Design a protein around this ligand. Structure first.
Ligand SMILES: CSC[C@H](NC(=O)Cc1ccccc1)C(=O)N[C@@H](Cc1ccccc1)[C@H](O)C(=O)N1CSC(C)(C)[C@H]1C(=O)N[C@H]1c2ccccc2C[C@H]1O
Ligand SMILES: C[C@H](CCC(=O)NCCC[N+](C)(C)CCCS(=O)(=O)[O-])[C@H]1CC[C@H]2[C@@H]3[C@H](O)C[C@@H]4C[C@H](O)CC[C@]4(C)[C@H]3C[C@H](O)[C@]12C
Ligand code: NA
Length: 327
């Protein structure tokens, strides 16, 4: 199985590296299960954000195949735009020709872009979520028979303790302890499963839960959040949807998620972010209120830091298991 090392960036996000072009041009990616396109910033970039990035130069790649088609990717955090290009993409020791976006304007993706040290985003979603109708990397590698299974695996790094791996094509027992529980997808094209959500006395039955690698938070329905925070001794930051607390706050709850198959819990230690610079013994909650059309939680980074996760295209399932504290 091919492995890609995952490095932590300030306990908000993680990255892994990969190559685009036979020139072996090396890029740092956010690895995002909730999107289905790959992009890298071009040498043709007109914007300030591209200043400090590894830039893609199609003139230095002999496997480059032109495709002028203009495209923009609209994320919740902003927009990047440019054009489609084709070239050899290499993930670990697995290569395949691939269609991706050459980004020339990142101004709509500020301040996220210039803030952090990633170059681009590598989607790990489903095909019907892609622009330009791009087969996902793992399913092509499967199809081309470079890996056993159409699946990938996340063992996330933890700040100041160990590194992580994205593993492609097969499941390695070393990453987790206890049982590995599979949860069927309740949607065709998202890593979305059904779970009862419990926080104290507040309960949502058969809630949609999206396992998502690119979101640095647990997201919660706004009504559910407003009930959770009632008398919690937490304070909202002015103008921003973030809550601050004493790290030691005895009332901070444990999320409990359950299926017929399993039980997954998330204790304060996984969703708190120390902000010692702002004040002594203060923490931010990595919890955001957000309403999808159907009541939904995003089980983001903080969930995935605790739980090893198996994303299975062939079995339309998400495997979940408690991550080992170190390898
Ligand atoms: C096919 S990509 C376009 C997609 N847009 C949508 O789904 C539109 C939408 C919006 C609200 C409800 C329902 C649907 C999208 O941006 N999805 C994102 C996940 C998402 C988040 C909220 C609501 C719906 C989907 C993406 O997978 C991601 O992690 N992204 C886009 S870019 C990113 C890799 C930096 C990261 C990010 O923004 N992360 C930030 C985020 C998002 C929500 C809560 C906290 C935070 C902090 C930070 O981590
Ligand atoms: C996705 C949700 C909800 C968006 C929403 O509720 N938007 C209503 C208006 C919708 N529009 C009319 C504009 C278009 C769609 C209408 S339509 O009906 O067509 O769908 C919004 C609301 C608050 C947003 C976060 C904060 O900012 C702080 C921070 C800023 C960074 O920079 C990026 C990260 C982060 C965490 C943000 C991410 C995300 O962005 C959040 C969660
Ligand atoms: Na995501």
């Amino acid at each position: 199985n091919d492995n890609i090392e995952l490095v932590d960036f300030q306990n908000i996000m993680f990255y892994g590296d990969a190559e685009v072009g036979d020139n072996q041009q090396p890029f740092t990616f956010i690895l995002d299960t909730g999107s289905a396109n790959l992009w890298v910033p071009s040498v043709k970039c007109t914007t300030a954000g591209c200043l400090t990035k590894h830039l893609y130069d199609s003139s230095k790649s002999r496997t480059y195949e032109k495709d002028g088609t203009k495209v923009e990717m609209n994320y919740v955090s902003g927009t990047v735009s440019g054009f489609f290009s084709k070239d050899l993409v290499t993930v670990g020791n697995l290569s395949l020709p691939y269609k991706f976006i050459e980004v020339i304007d990142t101004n709509g993706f500020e301040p996220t872009y210039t803030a952090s040290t990633f170059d681009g985003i590598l989607g790990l979603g489903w095909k019907d979520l892609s622009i330009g109708s791009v087969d996902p990397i793992v399913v092509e590698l499967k199809n081309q028979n470079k890996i056993e299974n159409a699946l990938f695996t996340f063992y996330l790094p933890v700040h100041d303790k160990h590194t992580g791996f994205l593993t492609i094509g097969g499941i390695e027992e070393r990453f987790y302890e206890g049982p590995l529980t599979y949860e069927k997808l309740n949607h065709d094209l998202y890593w979305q499963i059904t779970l009862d959500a419990h926080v104290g006395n507040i309960m949502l039955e058969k809630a949609n839960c999206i396992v998502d690698s690119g979101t640095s938070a647990i997201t919660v329905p706004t009504d559910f959040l407003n009930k959770m925070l009632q008398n919690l001794d937490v304070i909202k930051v002015p103008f921003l949807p973030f809550y601050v607390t004493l790290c030691n706050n005895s009332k901070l709850p444990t999320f409990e998620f359950t299926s017929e198959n399993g039980k997954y819990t998330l204790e304060p230690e996984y969703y708190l972010q120390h902000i010692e610079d702002v004040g002594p013994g203060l923490c931010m909650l990595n919890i955001i209120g957000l309403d999808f059309p159907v009541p939904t939680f995003i089980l983001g980074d903080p969930f995935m830091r605790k739980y090893f996760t198996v994303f299975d295209y062939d079995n339309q399932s998400v495997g979940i298991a408690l991550a080992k504290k170190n390898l």
